[PDB]
Each structure stands twice: as C-alpha cells, then as structure tokens.
Design an enzyme around this catalytic site. Structure first.
Site, PDB file in Angstrom:
ATOM      1  N   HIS A  40      13.559  -3.150 -45.246  1.00 29.83           N
ATOM      2  CA  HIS A  40      13.741  -2.283 -46.412  1.00 29.83           C
ATOM      3  C   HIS A  40      12.450  -1.555 -46.813  1.00 29.83           C
ATOM      4  O   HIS A  40      12.515  -0.689 -47.686  1.00 29.83           O
ATOM      5  CB  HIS A  40      14.319  -3.026 -47.608  1.00 29.83           C
ATOM      6  CG  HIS A  40      13.363  -3.806 -48.434  1.00 29.83           C
ATOM      7  ND1 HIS A  40      13.103  -5.164 -48.332  1.00 29.83           N
ATOM      8  CD2 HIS A  40      12.652  -3.366 -49.485  1.00 29.83           C
ATOM      9  CE1 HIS A  40      12.233  -5.515 -49.295  1.00 29.83           C
ATOM     10  NE2 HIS A  40      11.976  -4.433 -50.027  1.00 29.83           N
ATOM     11  N   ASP A  84      16.457  -8.589 -42.864  1.00 31.88           N
ATOM     12  CA  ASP A  84      15.438  -7.725 -43.461  1.00 31.88           C
ATOM     13  C   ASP A  84      14.086  -7.962 -42.790  1.00 31.88           C
ATOM     14  O   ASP A  84      13.202  -8.623 -43.359  1.00 31.88           O
ATOM     15  CB  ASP A  84      15.373  -7.972 -44.951  1.00 31.88           C
ATOM     16  CG  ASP A  84      14.576  -6.937 -45.730  1.00 31.88           C
ATOM     17  OD1 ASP A  84      14.210  -5.913 -45.110  1.00 31.88           O
ATOM     18  OD2 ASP A  84      14.275  -7.204 -46.959  1.00 31.88           O
ATOM     19  N   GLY A 175       6.596  -4.330 -54.588  1.00 33.92           N
ATOM     20  CA  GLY A 175       5.282  -4.035 -54.021  1.00 33.92           C
ATOM     21  C   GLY A 175       4.758  -5.150 -53.122  1.00 33.92           C
ATOM     22  O   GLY A 175       3.834  -4.929 -52.330  1.00 33.92           O
ATOM     23  N   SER A 177       6.936  -6.786 -51.254  1.00 34.71           N
ATOM     24  CA  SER A 177       7.924  -6.645 -50.190  1.00 34.71           C
ATOM     25  C   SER A 177       7.268  -6.446 -48.837  1.00 34.71           C
ATOM     26  O   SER A 177       6.321  -5.661 -48.726  1.00 34.71           O
ATOM     27  CB  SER A 177       8.819  -5.470 -50.499  1.00 34.71           C
ATOM     28  OG  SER A 177       9.600  -5.759 -51.641  1.00 34.71           O
ATOM     29  N   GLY A 178       7.815  -7.120 -47.835  1.00 32.88           N
ATOM     30  CA  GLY A 178       7.282  -7.039 -46.498  1.00 32.88           C
ATOM     31  C   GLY A 178       6.158  -8.027 -46.211  1.00 32.88           C
ATOM     32  O   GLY A 178       5.851  -8.244 -45.039  1.00 32.88           O
TER      33      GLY A 178
END
Ligand SMILES: [Ca+2]
Length: 223
Positions: A40, A84, A175, A177-178
């Site tokens: 995402h 994801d 922020g 995320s990942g």
C-alpha cells in the site's frame, strides 16, 4: 510511532525512508540491493534513503539511491490489505557499514508474547498530528491470534498478526507504514494497518513476513 522513544542515530541500521519529494513510508533493507516495504506504499518515483536519522537534515551518513523497479505481491488486495508486501530494487548497491546494514529474513514464524522493535517517522499523536524529524522506536509484543481476531472480527487473515497494547497509548501510525517489526533479530512484520493509532482494543496489524520468504528469495534470484 505513538508513545515510543527516540531510537538514537543509526541504531536501527536496516530502517529506510521512502521519499517521493517527501518522506511517505518506511522500509527494511534485506541485502545491498533490495528493500521490503508495504504494497500500500506503492508509488512511482521512489528514492530510497538509507543511513537516516533526521530526515530533514543531511547529517553525513546517508545514502540516497533511486529505485530501479518495484514489485507488489501478486496477490495484494488493496481493499483488505491481504498480502501487503512489496519489494523495491535499488538502481545501485548500497555500501554496507555500521550505519547501513541488512536485516535477516525469518526461517521460522514468531510467537505470541515475543517483544519486537517497531520503528519509523510516522505520526506521534493519537488524534492530533505531529510528525517527527528523528527516528522513533517502540517495543511491542505480538498478540495472540484469538485476541487479534476479536479486535478486528472478519478482517484478519493468516497473513496478518497483531502487536501492541489493548489498553492503547502505544502503537505505530500513518507514515510508519512499510517499516519494520523486528523480533529476535529477524524481520517478522511490516507496518500495515490499524483502526486509528494507539486506540483502546484496536492494536496494530502487521504483514506476516514469514509467509513470504519463498516469494522474496525467488524474486531476488530472478531480478
Ligand atoms: Ca538526514
């Protein structure tokens, strides 16, 4: 990261910032040429920033390398966030040193009750908004699958796990995320989703990296 602490410059040497004119997601360096992040977080025009602490000041240990290719998981479902995960290949190899280092992929999946380290440059408030300049860290346990499923009924797949605090106050956030969830020296999770941040009975939901190691290894061996 809500309710975390300042990590310390380059103490999380596998943490990367993804930059598209601005920091927008985290990632993890898994060898000199590859980064793992969340699907995402996909966009075109990614520059990978390694060796960062303050993302708004050039302090002298950074490496800025453009992505040559992004590869979103073949089964990524952007509606449910199932699978994801994304791989990013660097145009040139990073120079590995004490400030820039890769994190091991898991051979075995992690267990409920294990304390993990989560890190990133995401929002530090629960309902307000404040983004940090320096990398933040959080210790958080993996929650049982039954508690995870109770928190998010009808929403959790076997490719997800929950980590955090049911009482709230401590969580990852937009922020982050990942970015990494590291447990016992292995990359076990990717910051994926949650209802808000640090809300009671709404813990963080993480991509379960141990389900993807075969795909990662085959993809790296072929691109
Ligand atoms: Ca910097």
């Amino acid at each position: 990261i809500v309710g975390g602490y300042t990590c310390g410059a380059n103490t999380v040497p596998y943490q990367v910032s993804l930059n598209s004119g601005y920091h927008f997601c985290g990632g993890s360096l898994i060898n000199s040429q590859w980064v793992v992040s969340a699907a995402h977080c996909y966009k075109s025009g990614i520059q990978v920033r390694l060796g960062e602490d303050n993302i708004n000041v050039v302090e002298g240990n950074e490496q800025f390398i453009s992505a040559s290719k992004s590869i979103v998981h073949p089964s990524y479902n952007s509606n449910t966030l199932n699978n994801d995960i994304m791989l990013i290949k660097l145009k040139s190899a990073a120079s590995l040193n004490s400030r820039v280092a890769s994190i091991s992929l898991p051979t075995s999946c992690a267990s409920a009750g294990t304390q993990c380290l989560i890190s990133g440059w995401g929002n530090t408030k629960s309902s307000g908004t404040s983004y940090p300049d320096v990398l933040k860290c959080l210790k958080a346990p993996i929650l049982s699958d039954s508690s995870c499923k109770s928190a998010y009924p009808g929403q959790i797949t076997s490719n997800m796990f929950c980590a955090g605090y049911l009482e709230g106050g401590k969580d990852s956030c937009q922020g982050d995320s990942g970015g990494p969830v590291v447990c016992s020296g292995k990359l076990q999770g990717i910051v994926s989703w949650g209802s808000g941040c640090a809300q009671k009975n709404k813990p963080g939901v993480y991509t379960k990296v141990c389900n993807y190691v075969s795909w990662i290894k085959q993809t790296i061996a072929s691109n």
